[PDB]
Amino acid sequence: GRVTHTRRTFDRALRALPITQHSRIWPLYLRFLRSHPLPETAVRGYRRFLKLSPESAEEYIEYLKSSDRLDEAAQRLATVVNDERFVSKAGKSNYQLWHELCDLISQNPDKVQSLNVDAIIRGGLTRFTDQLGKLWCSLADYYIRSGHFEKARDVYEEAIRTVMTVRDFTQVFDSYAQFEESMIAAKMETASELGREEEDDVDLELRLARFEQLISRRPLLLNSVLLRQNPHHVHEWHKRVALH
Amino acid sequence: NAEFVTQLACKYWAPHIKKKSPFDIKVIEDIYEKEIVKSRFAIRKIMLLEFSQYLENYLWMNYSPEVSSKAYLMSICCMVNEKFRENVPAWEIFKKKPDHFPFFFKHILKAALAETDGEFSLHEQTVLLLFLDHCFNSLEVDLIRSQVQQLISLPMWMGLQLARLELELKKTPKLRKFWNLIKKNDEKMDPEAREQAYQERRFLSQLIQKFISVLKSVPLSEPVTMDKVHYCERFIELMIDLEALLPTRRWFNTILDDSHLLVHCYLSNLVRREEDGHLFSQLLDMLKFYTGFEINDQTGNALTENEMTTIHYDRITSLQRAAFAHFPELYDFALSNVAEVDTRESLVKFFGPLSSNTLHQVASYLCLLPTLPKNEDTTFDKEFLLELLVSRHERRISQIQQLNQMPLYPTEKIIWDENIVPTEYYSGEGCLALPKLNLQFLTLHDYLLRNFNLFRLESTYEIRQDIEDSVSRMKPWQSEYGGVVFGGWARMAQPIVAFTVVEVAKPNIGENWPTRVRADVTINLNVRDHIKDEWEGLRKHDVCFLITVRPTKPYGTKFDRRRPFIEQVGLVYVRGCEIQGMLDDKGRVIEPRPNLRGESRTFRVFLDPNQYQQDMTNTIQNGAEDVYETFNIIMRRFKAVLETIRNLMNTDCVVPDWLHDIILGYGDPSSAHYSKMPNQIATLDFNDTFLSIEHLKASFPGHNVKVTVEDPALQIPPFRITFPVEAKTLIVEPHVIPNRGPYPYNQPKRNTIQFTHTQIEAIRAGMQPGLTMVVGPPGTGKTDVAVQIISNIYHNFPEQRTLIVTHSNQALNQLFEKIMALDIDERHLLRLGHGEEELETEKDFSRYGRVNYVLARRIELLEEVKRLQKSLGVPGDASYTCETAGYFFLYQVMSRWEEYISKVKNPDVTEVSTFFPFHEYFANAPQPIFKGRSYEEDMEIAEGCFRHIKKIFTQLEEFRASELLRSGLDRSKYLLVKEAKIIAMTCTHAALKRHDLVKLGFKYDNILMEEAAQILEIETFIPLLLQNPQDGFSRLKRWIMIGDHHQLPPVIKNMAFQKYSNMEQSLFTRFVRVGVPTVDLDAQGRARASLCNLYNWRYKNLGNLPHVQLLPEFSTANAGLLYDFQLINVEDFQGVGESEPNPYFYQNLGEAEYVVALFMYMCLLGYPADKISILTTYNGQKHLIRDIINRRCGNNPLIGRPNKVTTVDRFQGQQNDYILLSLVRTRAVGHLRDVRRLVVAMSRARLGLYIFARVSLFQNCFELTPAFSQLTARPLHLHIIPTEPFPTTRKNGERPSHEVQIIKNMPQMANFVYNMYMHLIQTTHHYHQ
């Protein structure tokens, strides 16, 4: 109950520096962390700026990420996301992928301002690339938590420029059907821009039916887009469809 | 009629006359009609009348409604105009006698609205336009605001069309309650008072209508008078001022929108006349830019893009609704969305083929004009209707994109433009499309655009006047195939045989401009030998110009002085350059020079950080020519700045919310005091200030000292001093600074300065969060107070960074030198620069010096760790680096201290010695530290030794960075990042590397500034953007600047900048003008009271310390001069008073030779040649003094050289025991009107000043009356004691015991000097050679 016994214990145990007494000192600071974040914070700073090992900041982060202080946990993770001489601070073990999993845990439906989740997805994609999966999820969340007016059209245009695989046009289709009325001139020309989308056998129907069944009136444009969407090679019934 | 005006003045109004003739309305009318009216408002007659002080002595003191006449009104208006032109306080007469100010300003506004070309001509009407603009821009004056009060107030909306005002009250419902309140309060008004109030409210509308009609009365191609054009121009100038001032625009801009003055302007033939209306169209362009500025009318804050876009698209939506309801031809137009019609193109494609009366109906339904009745003809053209509609509903580009699309270089359409970048001969009669930087800005972007326009206009004034320097001697000629040709020989100019851009070095991260751009200029010196020596004496950093001209006068065209030099010589562009050295046959810049063979010399120069950045931007973005290749000349005697402005404009400029409105000048300016900071630290340690409890009692004249300890021998520590929040009680809590070991050499360094209570109040305002300005008079210790405040801040705040900004080398070197005597370790002080910087301190604060000190202290710390290991008796022969030293500290020293603590803190004074186990670590120390008499003191000394070892380990933990950064630049960056808690640099270096350190890891927590009166509005607005914000808030917690509002400001390259824009109004002086508290030191110790009175009259209770009052050196007589400060008249000699060898090269051999006889008399009396300073009113006068002195004394073995013979302002920041002032001016007073330069040249003497001046010329200077009162208290001759050598035991007051000579003139003075020197030549001899 008094810090004198624990401090003197850890001090006389640090007489040498073999593997022993780490499993005392680290959990000693961990138990001190209750009722005061100061011992855990300063001991974590001293450890991660102290004696040489890969697992020092690992145990510090395992103790600090379960806590109610995430700045200290991601701060150990930042001293790790430098590593200052060693890309593979762990190798096939990943602690930056761990930071990205923490970023997903913070992108969980807690801070829904549509700012921090997308910024954390950009930070996790910037640490290590996330190709079309977390990228498709980040573009989906950015286009879905956004509005309907030209802001959603710009979101879907940039996300199309960055798009990798199919169903990104489906995400832009969702944005368009939700944006059925973004202005009083073309009424979300995104319906046409996405119905005439990529040329052969990909969706051919997604954005068309989106504009068609926003609720329903009559699209009168989805037909022209879809039958103008690359019928078979040049000489065929293609003129008949494009004329009908 | 110069003699007529002078006789009339001396008879009726001129000062320095016993009896004056009384005022007569006939006198005023005759003077005006016969001098201004007959000679068409003469500038020289205006100047002579100003020197006669008609407004201060004649006009207003006898003016009244019964004396109100057109001549008197126009005379007072022209006097205020000339006051603004010459930068003199103008309305002091109105502040003295505000009684007839209502009738005066009312009759002036009546004259401005009166019939044009009637009683008051267009000349007087434009004069009244500019005078009214001045009366609006001087609205910080109570009485002028009193006349603008109801005239520019919200009741100014009484002049708008009924539909527009009704729509305004509908869009802002709370305006309807205020309108009802105004209508109700108007009921209690008299008919005369009601008519006066409505006339005041409609004055602006009637004036705008009159100006628009004056414009419409100008024909397109037929020649018209320039006066009407200039009247419309000055009207647009007043419009621009009242449109850029927020509380002045709030209501007037609504009437300006209702009238659409911009529309009639851009429709008139005046805006189509390229040569007639160039500057007027430029002013109208500024007005349209400001009318389309994104600033909320209701609160004054800048709007969001969503806000302005909503406004435009809502106008579009209401226009579409109005189309559907009232225009059948526009059913499609009502069906067209924002993206369909918001561009001028489609808006005009829909509104242009409409009818004239139809567009009038559109305007009427949109409340633009009077309603168009049935079957009528609208007298406004379809051109007018469609233009107004398209300008109102067409898309506008944001100011952000507009500012970012500007190339940062001056082009060929600007280099020769006087309407925005005028010359140095500009008299001030006309207007310039110039920014206004005085008091308050609509937004930070507004103030930044003004400051950026000003900096770029200064650079264009440097690319205009020096641009015509392709050899400027004999008007360079055009030659075969239009090429250049040198027609003569030029001394200060030469044609360059080539110029090659040698280095394009990469920028620092973040900034948008390279770090170094150099060019080598090759010229073949086939000219005189001494001229070639002057040329080849090239050195480092010497300011050079590369000049480009595309001359148009063919070979042999005559030269004419009064013509515009720019077009005369065909100038193209001139960019500055900084020569690093001459290149020789080894390709090396000159750093014992190698012997030049041939006459070809190539010099390597590099202008700026962004030297070759701005022209690159121009040629890349908008097709400008490569200006670094068409230059013709090299001549000796702003792109990075605009890039820093762009950084400010393109970043969110996240400024402290307590500094936003402060830099904007609006609101309550007292919210910046440590008295208005809610974050004040109640219990603070000013420790290094208070030297005693008596001193702590003396620094609090009106405070009750409540000291928590009564024992007097136990209260003078670094005593903690808490300030209250009964209500005057300051708590003195004694302490003890904890020991740091056994060596008495580690005793913390303490100040020796007994700072007065005012200086202590300034240091305390600095050590309490917020902003402060400390007024430092000559010799009150501004640098000392800065070092003391920084000391206290470092004392109470260990992790905080101190950002010490300065203007010049002497200021920062004084900061470091005074810091050298404080208890500050050499690991926390850091210095930046612009490159090369002479170390003017004792110890090296530089980058390389810092890495070297790091290496030295790291050697020391690792050696202490090794010797501590030996003291511990450890096995092992290896040496330890800082990582191993940290490991060993935590392993043994911390462990040993833990053992000692568990032994002695859980209890004998014998145990104090038994259980300190580093005895072999303390074997090299005083006799055993633990004395064992007292357990507490023994524990203190032992813990101090263990903490000393801990500080060794902490210095090693710091030096980890020096081992982790192999490069010197890298380790120095690491020190500036973590090790540096003191970052001190120049404003130029801040504006240069601002973004660089910002992306590199710069921090700012507490900032101090020196020479705040020497850095510009933009140069002092720069440091606010030194870092990035932290979590939605800036990191800046405090800024304490020390300056002097009465001293020299930064110098404008071409004086047209302060002439028109008044950019000389610095941030410090502008804060003073706001009225912010200034902590005014007044305790001098460098000038005895008699000499100090020459500058202490200008300040707030300026005094001297007991040191200056009682110094034995202070009242010591000046050898051979019974006068300590003398102003001796210099009459005509050889017929010459003020003389002029070259245009504007003023010199006076008369006062020069009087100063020569005086300085040679000092040399012949033995006065120390170091203590003889020669200053002048002209650099030409300094050069004449130097030439005549080196021609007469030269190597006279009895005579040294006067330490300084140079420019008055170029001697600022310095002082002398004797300053010899040459006031050559006797024809015009010149720039001596500036009280700043006055106090500057008057505070150059610590104990002795000898001035040769024109007594009557000086007394005629009204600004120089408090100075001439102390000047003419002495005889107007040289009153000396010639037989008195260097040592004179006599006091300043004690009677002379020698022969007194009263020399009446320079010829007798020089003859007597030569005769005394001749007797010295027959009796004595010197031997230095």
Q: Cα-Cα-Cα-Cα dihedral of A81, A85, A90, A93, to 10°?
A: 50
Tokens found for residue B161:
């069309």
3-state helix, strand, coil split of chain A in percent (to 5) is 60, 0, 40
Q: Is B552 in the A-facing interface, judged by CB distances under 8 Å?
A: no
| DSSP string across B700-713 | -TTSEEEES---GG
- Nearest residue in chain B measured CA to CA from A17: B891
Alpha-carbon distance of B939 to B1054, in angstroms, equals 68
The verdict on a CB contact (< 8 Å) between A183 and B887 is no
Note the Cα B825 to chain centre separation in Å: 34
Q: ∠B240-B244-B249 over CA atoms, to 5°?
A: 95
Q: What are phi and psi of B737, to 5 degrees?
A: -65, 120
The total of other beta-carbon atoms located within 10 Å of residue B118's CB is 8
Alpha-carbon distance of A106 to A112, in angstroms, equals 10
Interface test with A, best of B310, B902, B959 (most A CBs within 10 A): B902
Alpha-carbon distance of B645 to B653, in angstroms, equals 11
The total of other beta-carbon atoms located within 10 Å of residue B691's CB is 15
Alpha-carbon distance of B1324 to B1329, in angstroms, equals 16
The verdict on a CB contact (< 8 Å) between B895 and A11 is yes
Alpha-carbon distance of B734 to B696, in angstroms, equals 12
* Amino acid found at B421: V
CB-based contacts of B130-134 (< 8 A; 24+ apart in sequence) = B130/B81, B130/B234, B130/B237, B130/B238, B130/B431, B131/B77, B131/B80, B131/B81, B132/B108, B132/B207, B132/B238, B133/B234, B133/B237, B133/B238, B133/B241, B133/B242, B134/B80, B134/B81, B134/B84, B134/B90
Put simply, the chain B residues between 922 and 981 with a CB less than 8 A from any chain A CB are: 964
Residue ranges of B for the binding site for ATP?
754, 759, 779-784
Tokens found for residue B73:
């009104």
Q: ∠B1174-B1179-B1182 over CA atoms, to 5°?
A: 35
Strand B829-831 and strand B1038-1043: pairing? unpaired
Strand B720-722 and strand B683-684: pairing? antiparallel
Tokens found for residue B479:
């030659």
Closest CA to B883 of B898, B909, B862: B862
Residues B243, B287: contact at Cβ < 8 Å? Answer: yes
Distance from CA of B656 to the nearest CA of A (A): 24
Note the Cα A225 to chain centre separation in Å: 34
Alpha-carbon distance of B1036 to B1004, in angstroms, equals 6
Please report which helix (H) or strand (E) contains residue B185, including its range.
Answer: helix B174-185
Residues B252, B261: contact at Cβ < 8 Å? Answer: no
Sheet architecture: strand order including B704-707? B683-684, B720-722, B729-733, B704-707
Place of tokens 């392709």: B470
Q: Give residues preceding each break in chain B, C–N over 2.5 A.
A: 591, 637, 725, 906
Alpha-carbon distance of B846 to B838, in angstroms, equals 10
Residues B290, B244: contact at Cβ < 8 Å? Answer: yes
Q: What are phi and psi of B814, to 5 degrees?
A: -65, -40
CB-based contacts of B304-313 (< 8 A; 24+ apart in sequence) = B305/B398, B308/B398, B312/B338, B312/B342, B312/B393, B312/B395, B312/B396, B313/B338, B313/B342
The partner residue sitting opposite A14, judged by closest CB among B339, B340, B891, is: B891
3-state secondary structure B734-792: CCCCCCCCCCHHHCCCCCCCCCCHHHHHHHHHHHCCEEEEEECCCCCCHHHHHHHHHHH
Distance from CA of A166 to the nearest CA of B (A): 30
The verdict on a CB contact (< 8 Å) between B335 and A184 is yes
- Nearest residue in chain B measured CA to CA from A186: B337
The total of other beta-carbon atoms located within 10 Å of residue B128's CB is 27
Alpha-carbon distance of B1309 to B1278, in angstroms, equals 9
Bridge partners of B1176? Answer: B1207, B1222
Tokens found for residue B43:
């500038």
Altogether, the residues listed in chain B come to a count of 1329
Residue B199 gets the label, from left (phi > 0), alpha (psi -120 to 50) or beta, of: alpha
Tokens found for residue B1148:
């006076």
Note the Cα B727 to chain centre separation in Å: 40
Q: Cα-Cα-Cα-Cα dihedral of B385, B386, B391, B395, to 10°?
A: 150
The verdict on a CB contact (< 8 Å) between A15 and B964 is no
Closest CA to B1011 of B992, B986, B989, B993: B986
Alpha-carbon distance of B1242 to B939, in angstroms, equals 60
Q: Which residues of B201-234 are buried (b: 16+ CB within 10 A; e: fewer)?
A: bbbbbebbbbbbebbeebeeeeebeeebbbbbbb
B12: helix, strand or coil: helix
The verdict on a CB contact (< 8 Å) between B894 and A12 is no
Task: Count H helices and E strands in chain A, helices first.
Answer: 14, 0
Q: ∠B7-B10-B12 over CA atoms, to 5°?
A: 100
The partner residue sitting opposite A11, judged by closest CB among B339, B340, B898, is: B898
B251: helix, strand or coil: helix
3-state secondary structure B1084-1109: ECCCCHHHHHHHHCCCCCCEECHHHH
Alpha-carbon distance of B1266 to B783, in angstroms, equals 28
Residue B1100 class from Cβ within 10 Å (0-12 exposed, 13-18 middle, 19+ buried)? exposed
Tokens found for residue B1256:
């009557």
Beta-carbon contacts of A152 under 8 Å, excluding residues fewer than 6 positions away, are A143, A146, A175, A178, A179, A182
Alpha-carbon distance of B971 to B240, in angstroms, equals 52
Q: Is B347 in the A-facing interface, judged by CB distances under 8 Å?
A: no
The verdict on a CB contact (< 8 Å) between A12 and B899 is yes
Interface test with B, best of A48, A56, A184, A188 (most B CBs within 10 A): A184
Alpha-carbon distance of B125 to B231, in angstroms, equals 7
**Distances in whole angstroms, Cα of residue B34 to Cα of each of B70, B121, B167, B283, B1085:** 14, 16, 53, 34, 55
Q: ∠A110-A112-A117 over CA atoms, to 5°?
A: 90
Residue ranges of B for the binding site?
754, 759, 779-784
B542: helix, strand or coil: strand
Alpha-carbon distance of B1029 to B414, in angstroms, equals 37
Helix residue spans in A18-167 (DSSP H) = 22-32, 37-48, 55-65, 70-82, 96-107, 116-127, 134-144, 150-161
Tokens found for residue A240:
């008949």
Sheet architecture: strand order including B829-831? B829-831, B982-986, B802-806, B1006-1010, B1038-1043, B770-775, B1079-1080
The total of other beta-carbon atoms located within 10 Å of residue B639's CB is 28
| DSSP string across B1131-1159 | --BTTBSSB-SSTT--B-HHHHHHHHHHH
Place of tokens 């004694």: B734
Bridge partners of B774? Answer: B1042, B1079
Residues B1009, B1062: contact at Cβ < 8 Å? Answer: no
Tokens found for residue B160:
């708008």
Closest CA to B719 of B703, B737, B701: B737
Closest CA to B124 of B69, B175, B167, B161: B69
CB-based contacts of B1181-1185 (< 8 A; 24+ apart in sequence) = B1181/B1146, B1181/B1147, B1181/B1148, B1181/B1151, B1181/B1152, B1181/B1222, B1181/B1224, B1182/B1206, B1182/B1207, B1182/B1222, B1183/B1147, B1184/B1147, B1184/B1148, B1184/B1149, B1184/B1152, B1185/B1152, B1185/B1155, B1185/B1156, B1185/B1222
Put simply, the chain B residues between 861 and 920 with a CB less than 8 A from any chain A CB are: 886-887, 890-892, 894-895, 898-899, 901-902, 906
**Distances in whole angstroms, Cα of residue B386 to Cα of each of B303, B315, B356:** 28, 16, 9
Q: Is B839 in the A-facing interface, judged by CB distances under 8 Å?
A: no
The verdict on a CB contact (< 8 Å) between A84 and B964 is yes
C-alpha neighbours within 13 Å on the C-beta side of residue B835: 11
Alpha-carbon distance of B1135 to B1150, in angstroms, equals 10
DSSP state of A95: S
Bridge partners of B772? Answer: B1040
Residues B1072, B804: contact at Cβ < 8 Å? Answer: no
Residues B894, B949: contact at Cβ < 8 Å? Answer: no
Alpha-carbon distance of B1280 to B1289, in angstroms, equals 15
Residues B882, B957: contact at Cβ < 8 Å? Answer: yes
Helix residue spans in B60-173 (DSSP H) = 70-86, 92-96, 101-113, 122-137, 142-151, 162-171
Beta-carbon contacts of B343 under 8 Å, excluding residues fewer than 6 positions away, are B394, B395
Q: In chain A, which residues touch B (CB < 8 A)?
A: 4, 7-8, 11-12, 14-17, 50-51, 84, 150, 183-186
Residues B894, B868: contact at Cβ < 8 Å? Answer: no
Please report which helix (H) or strand (E) contains residue A170, including its range.
Answer: helix A168-178
Place of tokens 């810090």: A3
The partner residue sitting opposite B887, judged by closest CB among A11, A51, A185, is: A51
Q: Which residues of B touch A14 (CB under 8 A)?
A: 890-891, 895
Please report which helix (H) or strand (E) contains residue B635, including its range.
Answer: strand B633-636
Tokens found for residue B1157:
């006889």
Q: Entry resolution in angstroms?
A: 3.4
A166: helix, strand or coil: coil
Please report how the helices B987-1000 and B639-650 are oriented relative to each other, as an axis angle in degrees rounded to 10: 50
Bridge partners of B485? Answer: B477
Please report which helix (H) or strand (E) contains residue B485, including its range.
Answer: strand B484-485
3-state helix, strand, coil split of chain B in percent (to 5) is 45, 10, 40
Note the Cα B454 to chain centre separation in Å: 12
The partner residue sitting opposite A4, judged by closest CB among B335, B890, B906, is: B906
| DSSP string across B1035-1083 | S--EEEEEE-TTS--PPPSSTHIIIII-TT--HHHHHHHHT---EE--E
Q: What are phi and psi of B720, to 5 degrees?
A: -75, 140
Alpha-carbon distance of B1192 to B1201, in angstroms, equals 12
Residue B1172 class from Cβ within 10 Å (0-12 exposed, 13-18 middle, 19+ buried)? buried
